[PDB]
Structure formats: C-alpha cells, structure tokens
Design a protein around this ligand. Structure first.
Ligand SMILES: [Mg+2]
Ligand SMILES: [Mg+2]
Ligand SMILES: [Mg+2]
Ligand SMILES: [Mg+2]
Ligand SMILES: [Mg+2]
Ligand SMILES: [Mg+2]
Ligand SMILES: [Mg+2]
Ligand SMILES: [Mg+2]
Ligand SMILES: [Mg+2]
Ligand SMILES: [Mg+2]
Ligand SMILES: [Mg+2]
Ligand SMILES: [Mg+2]
Ligand SMILES: [Mg+2]
Ligand SMILES: [Mg+2]
Ligand SMILES: [Mg+2]
Ligand SMILES: [Mg+2]
Ligand SMILES: [Mg+2]
Ligand SMILES: [Mg+2]
Ligand SMILES: [Mg+2]
Ligand SMILES: [Mg+2]
Lengths: 234, 150, 138
RNA sequence: CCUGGUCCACCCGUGACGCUGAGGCGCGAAAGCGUGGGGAGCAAACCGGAUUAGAUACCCGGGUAGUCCACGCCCUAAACGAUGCGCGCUAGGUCUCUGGGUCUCCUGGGGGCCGAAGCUAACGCGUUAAGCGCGCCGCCUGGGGAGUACGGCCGCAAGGC
RNA sequence: CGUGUAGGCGGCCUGGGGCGUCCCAUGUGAAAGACCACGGCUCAACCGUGGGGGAGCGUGGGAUACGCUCAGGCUAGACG
C-alpha cells in the first residue's frame, strides 16, 4: 500500500541546495533534482511510527508545527482530528523553553474568553471594546492550537525541521524527542525520529501527516476515514 | 536544595549621557557533596537578586562527578579559551589544593584529595567554566570499557 | 612526501573520528598494521583490512564511537578521544621498563615498539621490557 | 628574434635520486649616487599671487634636479595576505580563469565569495586554514631610551646590515 | 624574494650486522649528609647501629620492532 502511494507523488525533493549529511538518504539526481531513496524511508517510517505508537498507546501528547503555507492548513486539520496541540502561525520563541510565561498569554486568552459572554460589556467604553476584541483576535490568532496541554509535549512532530529549527532547538535543549519530515534541505543528525521525503508539494505532507495521525488514533479507538484534504489540491 | 557557595561578585557598568548605569555579577557553585555540582552565573540590577539568579541557573546546569575514595578517577587537563586547568588525583589524606575558584567548585563536588594547577588566563569566571568541563569529562574503569564492548 | 607515516596514520584517524566516519584508508605497512592490531585487540576500532586503490595498498580501518546522546549536539562520544605520537622523527623517545608511562591512570594505553614485538604499557611492563614509546591512546 | 618558469594528456623511461636549508651567491619598488646621453608633460627645492593673527602649508601662476635611456652603484619599504617552505588528512554552496574526456556531465591547475567540523582573546580563519599532524629554517620574551651608541663589515656618498 | 653549502629530517618489502635502543648478570658508584626502621644522651637538636636505595660508566650474555649501516627488489614521492 505505502510503496505505491508515496512513490506515486510523495518522494524526491530539494535539489543542489542540499546538506551532505542527508546523503545516506538519497538515491540519485534525476534531471537535477535530488530523488530520495524511498526504500530507506520505510525502514525509517517504521521506527518512527514504532515510537509514535509506543506513545499513542501510553497517552502522551505531541506538539505539531508547520508555519509554511504549503504545509500550514494540513496541520490544523490532522491536529484537531487527533486532539493534539499545534502551531500554525508564527512559532513564537521560548514557547517551550520559556513556557511558564507564554502560558501567561494563554491565561490571557481565556481572560477575554470569559469576559466575552458577560454583563461587563454593557460598559467598557468603545476604546476598550475595539481593544479587548482585537486583543482577543490576535490572541486567538496564534494560540488556536497552542493551549491544549499546559505541559511540555513528550515529543514534537514537524514538517521542515530546518524551516522551524528554532523550535527544534528549544525541544532539543529540553530533552524532548523530536519527530519530523525532513527533505534534503535538512540535516538528519539533530533529529531523533526522522521522516525523509518531500516537504513542499502538499502531496507528501498529507500522505505522511494523515497516516501519522491515523496511527495516533489507532491506540485510542475510532478508526475512521481520512480527513479534509482535497478542495483545491491541484 | 544542595550546598550553594558563592565564588565571586563584581560591579560592572556601562555608559549613557548623564552618567554610568550599573549591574552586578554572581558566579556561584552548588553541591550536596555526593558527586553532584552545578555552576551558575547571574547578572542583575542588584547584589542580592544577582546572587539569587546564581543558584537558579546553578541547579539548572549540574554534573555527575564520579568520585572514588573521595578523590577522582583519572588525571585530566582542559583549556577553556585562554584559561587552562589541571586536575590530578591524590591519595586519601592530602587536601583539596587549588585556588578559591577551583577549590570551591571542587569541595561541593565532594573531592577531598585532589592536586590542581591553574594555568593560562586566571580569569575567575573562565577558570570556573573550565573546572566544570574538566569534571564533565571524567571517566571510570566502567564507562571506559563500556565503550570498548563490541 | 610524509616524513613520519605513523604520525600520519594516527592523524588520519584523529581526523576521521572528528566527524564520525565509517572507515579510513591509511596507506599500508606491516608496522602500521602491527599498531592497528593493538587498536583492535584493545578495542579502539572494529578493526582493519587490506585493500587496494589501483595496485596501491591502503588499510580500511573501521572506527568505533559511543552511543547517540540526548540534549543538543546529540553527536556520540568517541572510543578514541585522544591520540598523539610520543617519540617523533625529530626527537626519538626511548624508555627503560621502569620509566614506561602509565597512561590516563590505567584508563588509557601507550603503544610502543620493542625488540620483541610492538607491546603496550601493561604488555611490556609485564613482559619485562622497554623500547621506543610510539604513542599514547585513550 | 632570444628565453624562463607552468598546467593538462598518454602511464613510456629512471628507481627514493627526497624535504628543508645556518653561512654563501643572485634578484630586489620608489627615492638616491657616479659617467655619458635625453628632456615634451609633470614636478621636491626655489620665485611669486592669494587665504591667514602669521602660512616657511593647503589653492593659483611659474619652475630646477629628477622622472626616460646606457653602464655601474645603492639594498630600503605598510618589500602586506602585516600569514616561511614541503607533504598527508578533515562537508559542501556559489562564479571565474585555463587545460583534457564515449562534453545537460566529469576531472586537473589557479584566482575569489559564503560557509561543516575544528581553531580563535575576540575580530575572524576555514581543502588558497589561522583546522588536524610531521619535517626543516627564521623570529618574539613589558614601554621609552633606540634600530640610538660603541665595535665590526659594506658603501662614492646618502646611508645600510 | 629565490638559489643552494653544511647540517637536521627520510616512501614500500626481503635478508646480513647489531651502532643507537631494550633486558639480565657482574664491577663500580668511599665515608658524611639524605630517606626508612631501632635504640644513647630525661625529649629534641645533635649523636651511634642496621637496612634500602643512586643515575651514570667498565665487563660478559641476550633480543632485533623503531632509528643506523651494508646487501637485494618495487613504484604511490621526486625527475625525465
Ligand atoms: Mg590557546
Ligand atoms: Mg626497473
Ligand atoms: Mg630550497
Ligand atoms: Mg633596488
Ligand atoms: Mg629609480
Ligand atoms: Mg642620474
Ligand atoms: Mg604649483
Ligand atoms: Mg607647471
Ligand atoms: Mg597588499
Ligand atoms: Mg623560509
Ligand atoms: Mg579551485
Ligand atoms: Mg570565508
Ligand atoms: Mg574548496
Ligand atoms: Mg627596561
Ligand atoms: Mg626600537
Ligand atoms: Mg634605519
Ligand atoms: Mg658604526
Ligand atoms: Mg642535503
Ligand atoms: Mg647493542
Ligand atoms: Mg653514600
């Protein structure tokens, strides 16, 4: 099932902008592009899942992050569709390493959330209404997915590890397992659990995220059909 | 909670139209005395606050000092930039011979019998930093041949 | 033109490990082999084998590093932390059996040629001999 | 016309014949010196005109050595990459010069930029190392006194070591 | 900045010597001092007894990996 799916349109990516470390994970250079050895992707998808699963069936939460447009929305779905915190906008800094503080801006979102449905708005001049509204707007804007667990995720899954290296660093300094889907434009070594393959064409990102979140809920019960993906998918 | 001894505190300063603002520094060590220690450097607008922050980072970053008889496993040398430190293990009943920096750090780490020499730059700060990486890199017959398995 | 091939080899290795490479071919030599043998017989490598790069005989020498690590810079520790030649082509170093060094307090080794085979610190000290201190490894 | 170094290709010849290098020898920008040519432009010195408190300067109009050639001296320099030479080893990205090939590619020498690892006091370096090693030479050991003094050697001198 | 004299440094394998290098034995390395023990002066300082050491160097024997030397072969340096 996998072989044909992935190889269908979910392998081979970045070209001549590589990073030699990631060579063990490459077959050749067709028409310029670096086409990765999928066969090795499996033996690596395996162990990775072998880790996802050994966590799924022990109820430990995973922070997903994707801040790139080509892979944004598709992480807002698979995350809601597995009840896992995520970061879809600008992955602010020190979210993890400075947790006891960023959490002060989540406790600031629900500060407004509950003064939203209330008799206090009868007052509060228009200067505090456009304000307290907007403040909630953006508050909600970046913290749509970063609330769920008020606790450090026992892991983090992510698209382009070098794209969101900042985050990777935070986790790395906090002894947090790091899972992610890195192309050639990414250095293996500093990734605990590695998903080698495309990282831009929305194809491989939905095919790997899906079965990622599909292996999530296969240790909780609720085996369903795939989640929203096609609406303008090419 | 561990021991927590204070190495040195200094008043630095910067410039700005009107006069010179300030800041104080705190280099601090910490250790139960079982083989656990941590070095921490703390800067803050006031003496006490700085000394506080000291211990906080101190505990944050700590190391497993593999003692032995109350001394140390092997002899090592480490350079931290311009400052170099020599740690050489002594027989029971010798003393902890070192400067205030390396001694302090070495006491709470446990050691009672150690020969030390402070070469290179003797920048208090940097000597400390150096002393740690020394310990950090300490091995026992165990974790030695534990790597020569195969 | 390589002044001292041995000190070369050692360095070849020293440079290899620094980035954790699989094997490295130092040009072949009975004495180098002899030395290499003691890196394997004592376990600083998986070992070595004879090879060829156009009628030209090097030695494939497979390194040996530690376990991957938690935290940042996950790079493993190394079996060969520190290797450096003692006796040199411009300052030959010899030792009676009583003078023989005690590397890294028993934890390390000091390879060294002799009239009865390339021994090591323990190996010579016990065999009851001395000879040209060749290098120190740990 | 005469002549040096140098890269590539073919794997043909020699069979370690190598690396370095105290002293020695050769070369060594400009200015400078000797003898003899040459002399348009430029231009120390020098002369005026301005500016200026003054203006032995800056700017302006003049202008001599010199700048050029031959032969012979002089031997300095921010003579700079302020980085001695040779060899091995340690990611790559990019553009550029110039060789060779069953030439969208590959490989060899060279000139650059960003950069692994690593070094670094920092700035920065980074297969054109300031990384990792070996060989051999040169050199440093607080500032001023002083590259002065004395002696010595060299030079016509100026002066050099 | 080159060139190169002496000198320092020397690629792969085989054999001979065994010069450096390595080991053993033996002579030597006075005594005093020093260091370890034991006692004499009431302790000590001083002082006596015994023991254990000392590189070096001479002599006899042994070893031959690395350096050297003589002998043989090779082509990865270097030259053509
Ligand atoms: Mg240093
Ligand atoms: Mg022939
Ligand atoms: Mg030369
Ligand atoms: Mg000249
Ligand atoms: Mg001239
Ligand atoms: Mg003239
Ligand atoms: Mg004029
Ligand atoms: Mg004129
Ligand atoms: Mg220049
Ligand atoms: Mg030179
Ligand atoms: Mg080039
Ligand atoms: Mg650069
Ligand atoms: Mg390069
Ligand atoms: Mg003085
Ligand atoms: Mg001077
Ligand atoms: Mg002068
Ligand atoms: Mg004179
Ligand atoms: Mg010569
Ligand atoms: Mg002999
Ligand atoms: Mg005596």
């Amino acid at each position: 099932v996998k072989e044909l799916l992935e190889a269908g349109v979910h392998f081979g990516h970045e070209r001549k902008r590589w990073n030699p470390k990631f060579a063990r994970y490459i077959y050749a250079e067709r028409n310029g592009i670096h086409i990765i050895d999928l066969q090795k992707t499996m033996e690596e998808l395996e162990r990775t899942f072998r880790f996802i699963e050994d966590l799924a069936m022990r109820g430990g939460t995973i922070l997903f992050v994707g801040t790139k447009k080509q892979a944004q929305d598709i992480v807002r779905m698979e995350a809601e569709r597995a009840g896992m915190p995520y970061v879809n906008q600008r992955w602010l800094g020190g979210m993890l390493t400075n947790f006891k503080t960023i959490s002060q801006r989540v406790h600031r979102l629900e500060e407004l959330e509950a003064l939203f449905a209330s008799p206090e708005i009868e007052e509060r001049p228009k200067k505090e209404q456009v304000r307290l509204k907007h403040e909630l707007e953006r508050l909600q804007k970046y913290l749509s997915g970063f609330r769920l667990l008020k606790r450090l995720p026992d892991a983090i899954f992510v698209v382009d590890p070098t794209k969101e290296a900042i985050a990777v660093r935070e986790a790395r300094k906090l002894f947090i397992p790091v899972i992610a889907l890195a192309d050639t434009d990414s250095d293996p070594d500093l990734v605990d659990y590695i998903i080698p393959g495309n990282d831009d064409a929305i194809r491989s990102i939905q095919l790997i995220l899906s079965r990622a979140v599909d292996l999530i809920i296969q240790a909780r019960g609720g085996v369903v059909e795939p989640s929203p993906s096609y609406a303008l998918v090419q | 909670d561990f021991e927590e001894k204070m190495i040195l505190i200094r008043r630095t300063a910067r410039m700005q139209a009107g006069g010179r603002r300030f800041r104080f520094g705190a280099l601090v060590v910490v250790g139960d005395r079982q083989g656990r220690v941590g070095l921490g450097f703390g800067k803050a607008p006031e003496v006490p606050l700085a000394v506080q922050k000291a211990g906080y980072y101190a505990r944050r970053n700590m190391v497993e000092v593999p003692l032995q008889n109350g001394t140390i496993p092997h002899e090592i040398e480490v350079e931290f930039g311009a400052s170099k430190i020599v740690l050489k293990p002594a027989a029971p009943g010798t003393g902890v011979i070192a400067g205030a920096v390396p001694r302090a750090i070495l006491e709470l780490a446990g050691v009672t019998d150690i020969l030390t020499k402070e070469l290179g730059s003797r920048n208090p700060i940097n000597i400390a930093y150096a002393t740690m990486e020394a310990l950090r890199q300490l091995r026992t017959k165990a974790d030695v041949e534990r790597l020569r398995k195969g | 033109m390589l002044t001292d091939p041995i000190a070369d080899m050692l360095t070849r290795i020293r440079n290899a490990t620094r980035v954790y490479k699989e094997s490295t071919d130092v040009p072949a030599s009975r004495f180098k082999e002899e030395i290499l043998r003691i890196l394997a017989r004592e376990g600083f490598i998986k070992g070595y084998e004879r090879v060829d790069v156009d009628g030209k005989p090097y030695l494939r020498v497979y390194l040996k590093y530690g376990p991957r690590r938690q935290g940042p810079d996950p790079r493993p520790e190394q079996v060969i932390h520190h290797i450096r030649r003692i006796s040199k082509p411009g300052r030959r170093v010899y030792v009676g059996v009583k003078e023989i060094p005690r590397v890294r307090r028993g934890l390390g080794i000091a390879i060294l040629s002799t009239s009865k085979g390339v021994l090591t610190d323990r190996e010579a000290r016990k065999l009851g001999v001395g000879g040209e201190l060749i290098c120190e490894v740990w």
